[PDB]
């Protein structure tokens, strides 16, 4: 094998990408699903929407949106979560995270431990 060649010029295409800074997310006692705001990713393919689950974080890319592309990610999870398990989904004008709970029966008091730590800053953080 080994055979190829070729070489063409590449204008400004896309490349940057929005911060999806405002977003909606839900716990329950079983599993935890996010909401977002994005008109147009329930028009989008699967394969300008790329997330990837973690133990405990959920990353999701979006591209060619609304005459724009979004990105989302979650690092710190105040719980962990099953990739296997955890899925996607999208919805009119809006985009699914589902994520598995690591262990049901579980409060979310923050999508994240961030918003934790900092929330909770003068606190029983000793012992």
Not at 10 to 32: C, E, H, L, M, R
Not at 37 to 61: A, I, M
Not at 99 to 123: A, H, I, M, P
Request: glycine content about 8%.
């Amino acid at each position: 094998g080994s055979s190829g060649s070729s070489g063409v010029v590449a204008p400004i295409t896309t490349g940057y990408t929005v911060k999806i800074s405002n977003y909606g997310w839900d716990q329950s006692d079983k599993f935890v699903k996010i909401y977002i705001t994005l008109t147009g990713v329930h028009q989008v393919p699967t394969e300008n929407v790329q997330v990837h689950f973690t133990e405990r974080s959920f990353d999701l890319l979006v591209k060619n949106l609304n005459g724009k592309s979004y990105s989302m990610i979650v690092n710190n999870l105040l719980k962990p979560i099953s990739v296997e398990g955890s899925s996607k989904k999208v919805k009119t004008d809006t985009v699914l995270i589902l994520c598995r709970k690591k262990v049901e029966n579980t409060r979310w008091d923050y999508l994240t431990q961030v918003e934790k730590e900092c929330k909770e800053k003068s606190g029983p953080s000793s012992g």
